[PDB]
Ligand binder design. Sequence first.
Ligand SMILES: NC(=O)c1cccn1Cc1ccccc1Cl
Length: 323
Amino acid sequence: PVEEYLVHALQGSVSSGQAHSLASLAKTWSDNEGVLLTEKLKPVDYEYREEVHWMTHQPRVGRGSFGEVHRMKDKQTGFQCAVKKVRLEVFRVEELVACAGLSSPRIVPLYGAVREGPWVNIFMELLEGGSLGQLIKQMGCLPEDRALYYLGQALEGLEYLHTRRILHGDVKADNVLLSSDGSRAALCDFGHALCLQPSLLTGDYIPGTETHMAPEVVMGKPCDAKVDIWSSCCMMLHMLNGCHPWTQYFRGPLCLKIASEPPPIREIPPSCAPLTAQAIQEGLRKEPVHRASAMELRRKVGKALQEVGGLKSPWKGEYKEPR
Ligand SMILES: NC(=O)c1cccn1Cc1ccccc1Cl
């Protein structure tokens, strides 16, 4: 009843505020307005404008698949964080409604969001270790113990999202980000995220990474929290091998082979310990009913880590040649 008025008070300004107000406002995003959740990112006379109140680090350098993520600084407070640019015309409301209010050390904190013209500018904590994706390229591929350690932390973030009926939608090394010493990993990018029930190919849908798609996505069957778990194990194989599943063996339209072919358990390295191999296999079952949940696999993975003597390799050790 007052809902309508609260939304209007938020439009046309940028304000210091809370996550519930950011979400409210973001629902209207299908000139300069938004909500900032930390006093470190501070508006100035109802505004927060790129190149006036905040400055991207120079020269411009772009991380992410679309080069859409930048280091920035609030001109008044000196606070540094990261900004992800999303184009307004393709903005998915779930990207801010999902993460808004979330609080978990396995999920990268959201610091605010400001619309300015054809951009939505999403702010978040800046994690200097970079993406797991860029660790893989830099190191070639990762030791079994480190890969387990990171899969498990991804899976912990997923327990937290899945418990609250949120699907991440594009779990992969590029969307896990690492603290500066490498010991903490955290899920980033709610651009493909989704609010769940206990179909998928309809509406505002942006599909995830093809190589990490589960079969129920691909064949258009009913989908659920289990689709993240498949992805997480494709990511595992990527950490271990230095390449995504499927890319080595099939060349044409990949999504056809994910449907018809057996799951890609042949890509498990043979020098992997028994329980590592088995954990990955249960996360890669083709029917969601037989696939492990986040909680089941996280548990399995944590004992898999224990079974190889725990985490012992240095974070940026020596280069392992890929497959
Ligand atoms: N939340 C982040 O920090 C983030 C999200 C996607 C990539 N990153 C890392 C990153 C982004 C911009 C500038 C420097 C770095 Cl190390």
